[PDB]
Design a protein around this ligand. Structure first.
Ligand code: HEM
Ligand code: HEM
Ligand SMILES: Cc1cc(N)nc(COc2cccc(CNCCc3cccc(F)c3)c2)c1
Ligand SMILES: Cc1cc(N)nc(COc2cccc(CNCCc3cccc(F)c3)c2)c1
Ligand SMILES: C[C@H](O)[C@H](O)[C@H]1CNc2nc(N)[nH]c(=O)c2N1
Ligand SMILES: C[C@H](O)[C@H](O)[C@H]1CNc2nc(N)[nH]c(=O)c2N1
Ligand SMILES: [Zn+2]
Lengths: 407, 411
């Protein structure tokens, strides 16, 4: 019930107590571990609300004060009356920061307290969402000097009035299936790209076309907007040694901005809460560029390097993979767009894990996602035992809206 | 119940019913996943159910379930347990049980090979000298001049737990680690503690960077005894790189035969506390872990120096670059000397075929993703994108405490 985690490289042992405050379930049981699975009324609301406010007032050192009891009372009164409630700005900021702090799959949580929170709870239309989002992108991009931020649209009500950003990221490239048989652009995005075409977008049918936004306000049908081109910072990818590399025509965008998740604070559900930081290099180089299901460019690079592709045991893939990742980091650094490498990112998370054990009693972490997708065991997270559990406030997955939308 | 696992690269979806035959526990709950934790006398009472369940599994596999032979064997084991309190496995059951422990080893990426396992029955062994001889024969048979063959040797089972057979070495072949007064380590830092035990017991340590450790063998609960593996029995490979001629001058080598000697083999409630087994290496086990862990040989700096990589910032990926070069060297050397080795691409692709096949013919394949995924280039190997259910089946291999923590010394 009081759990220990060992780091097998440093022998440092930490004691986890925070896990007892765990509320949601994992997918696992005593009989079966589901660690590698990608996706495992008035009644319930007040307990959820109280649980939250209790932690909030405890965090500001006013646990059991009149202000505390007053708010508890106040919120209770509002739920009984309105069947929901509203968070104070302070509570909203705190909630959102803590959903980040609690995301057990995020290697970048050392940063969790520097989140700029944009309260867009007054937004009513999809045009308004477009305005808030452009402001978010522009603030976050900060001419390549990236700052973390989240924009929070209004909370879910009866659930027929949801705000949704239909894009999975604010900034993503299109994907088109061709008669050709193969896929042009980003294969991860074919379906959503078809929804954009079938809502009216005129696709340029390039390899790297920035998707338009599909914004849904107040449960209405979603609308298309294009992010001003001048707000979408992009980096052309060159290698610091291979002159030919830039001839591959690769670019990526600078701003990672997840837009399809659901933020739950104190029982309240914010179904549109796009949030952003800055990239860890491997996210682009390893996954975006080299995944079979993605841009899949390893063969093309190995070829240009003239490696023996005859046998897997020449490790031509591994070699091409590293060079692609050197190129990503190099291109971003050259243009002064913030980026972190996996060595530096994971070292940061180990320091952060340690701060959270000594300051909070632990840190939920999901090893499967924390350990980078290349060079695993030469980063310190690999040797680090982690405990995975769910705390609230949290970010959660929600069904793609096209599967849900009453048209 | 039916459980599904998706492959996110191929969209292949599999269905597992085998997890329903699981008994042992995971250490996870509905509130906490312990999937990345490294290490999460029996009585007549528990014994017969465990025996019966094993023998039902056995008798099904040979299509004799419910036969008279089946029933008489249950009868016979029942009796033996009641009067003698344990029981003896037949050779064929022993063989089946050891194959199955391997098959059920959820952290093993090499299970495609599970049915080709030479079983050596050393249950007539009585002394440490007897153990030595069995182990030498194992090592010589498994090595097979570089054309490695899987094998296991199985010494007598636990009785009162006061008479255990144990191999104190953690692998049969392993390099001495020596702690220096200055605080640095000579040889393999993983094996420092055990090297001290060997020295304390009378080994004359050559004190090099690559000294093959002597065996420390306990028979029948007696104090362990020391023996040297005949050097001519120990196949080693000097490590060179195909383009980098300076690689050989690093002075690296490694042994050909990976042979785990510190696990417990549980079959039908019986506990085989000495059961050394050996296979062949996946390159990354030597090239990533043994050479480049900071707690092991730790040769990354030195390799990247010689390659003259920009070592000022980690974002040049100098570590990653050197790691690949070392791993190429390891595979290249073993291939050049005709010592069996598999690369991590080939190994993980074979496992995915094995795993699918196991889903078709067996109803599942317990797998531990934290362990199956290789320690380099994770995401470009097909296992990375494979969802996997982890659970425990018997027969099984288990950890057991190091014998120096538990042995009652006689003197
Ligand atoms: C500041 C730089 C940041 C870095 C380097 C970073 C890093 C990452 C990485 C590498 C992942 C792995 C998932 C994948 O491979 O796609 C991840 C997951 C995640 N991060 Fe971050 N992160 C950052 C900022 C943020 C921010 C600002 C938030 C939210 C406020 C956030 C919330 C998440 C969540 C919710 C997940 C996982 C979603 C899930 O459960 O599957 N991160 N992060
Ligand atoms: C055929 C060659 C084999 C290869 C390439 C292979 C590969 C591996 C690798 C890479 C691991 C991960 C452990 C680590 O990285 O330290 C492993 C684990 C294991 N393998 Fe194998 N294996 C082979 C044969 C065998 C054999 C013959 C057995 C026994 C019959 C066996 C039983 C195990 C067990 C028990 C584990 C996991 C230890 C644990 O639970 O922590 N393997 N295998
Ligand atoms: C804010 C931020 C910064 C940064 N450097 N990296 C990130 C990456 O975080 C996320 C968060 C949510 C989702 C994703 C995309 N990754 C896989 C999600 C997923 C789940 C289930 C099914 C899928 F097809 C895909 C990535 C986020
Ligand atoms: C038979 C065989 C072939 C092959 N290629 N590789 C192996 C490696 O498998 C094992 C099996 C058991 C133990 C080990 C040693 N490493 C993990 C055990 C362990 C536990 C706790 C802490 C550690 F540092 C190490 C490795 C075994
Ligand atoms: C099957 C497995 O859960 C899946 O491939 C995971 C593994 N680890 C990951 N880790 C990160 N950071 N991102 C991912 O998308 C995945 N995919
Ligand atoms: C803490 C973590 O579980 C530990 O480092 C594990 C991770 N995965 C591993 N995977 C393999 N194959 N071998 C190992 O020793 C480890 N170590
Ligand atoms: Zn689990």
């Amino acid at each position: 019930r009081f759990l220990k985690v060992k780091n097998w490289e440093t022998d440092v042992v930490l004691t986890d107590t925070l896990h007892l405050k765990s509320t949601l379930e994992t997918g696992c049981t005593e009989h079966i571990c589901m660690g590698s699975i990608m996706l495992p009324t008035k009644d319930q609301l007040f307990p959820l609300a109280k649980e939250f406010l209790d932690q909030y007032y405890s965090s500001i050192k006013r646990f059991g004060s009149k202000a505390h009891m007053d708010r508890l009372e106040e919120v209770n009164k509002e739920i009984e009356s309105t069947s929901t409630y509203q968070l104070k700005d302070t509570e909203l900021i705190y909630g959102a920061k803590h959903a980040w702090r609690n995301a057990s799959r995020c290697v970048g949580r050392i940063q969790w307290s520097k989140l700029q929170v944009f309260d867009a709870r007054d937004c009513t239309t999809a045009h308004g969402m477009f305005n808030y989002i452009c402001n978010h992108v522009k603030y976050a991009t900060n001419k390549g000097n990236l700052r973390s931020a989240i924009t929070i649209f209004p909370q879910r009500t009866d659930g027929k009035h949801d705000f949704r950003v239909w894009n999975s990221q604010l900034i993503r490239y299109a994907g088109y299936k061709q008669p050709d048989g193969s896929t042009l652009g980003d294969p991860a995005n074919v379906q959503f790209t078809e929804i954009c075409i079938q809502q009216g977008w005129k696709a340029p049918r390039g390899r790297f076309d920035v998707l338009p936004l599909l914004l849904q306000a107040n449960g209405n049908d979603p609308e298309l907007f294009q992010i001003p081109p001048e707000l979408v910072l992009e980096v052309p990818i060159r290698h610091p040694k291979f002159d030919w590399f830039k001839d591959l025509g690769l670019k990526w965008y600078g701003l990672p901005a997840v837009s399809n998740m659901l933020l739950e604070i104190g029982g309240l559900e914010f179904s549109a809460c796009p949030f952003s930081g800055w990239y860890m290099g491997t996210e682009i180089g390893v996954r975006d560029y080299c995944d079979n299901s993605r841009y899949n460019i390893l063969e093309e690079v190995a070829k240009k390097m003239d490696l023996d592709m005859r046998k897997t045991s020449s490790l031509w893939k591994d070699q091409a993979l590293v060079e692609i990742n050197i190129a990503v980091l190099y291109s971003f650094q050259s243009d002064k767009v913030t980026i972190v490498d996996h060595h530096s990112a994971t070292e940061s998370f180990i320091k952060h894990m340690e701060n959270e054990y000594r300051c909070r009693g632990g840190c939920p972490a999901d090893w499967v996602w924390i350990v980078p997708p290349m060079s695993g065991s030469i980063t310190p997270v690999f040797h680090q035992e982690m405990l995975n559990y769910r705390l609230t406030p949290s970010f959660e997955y929600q069904p793609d809206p096209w599967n849900t939308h009453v048209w």
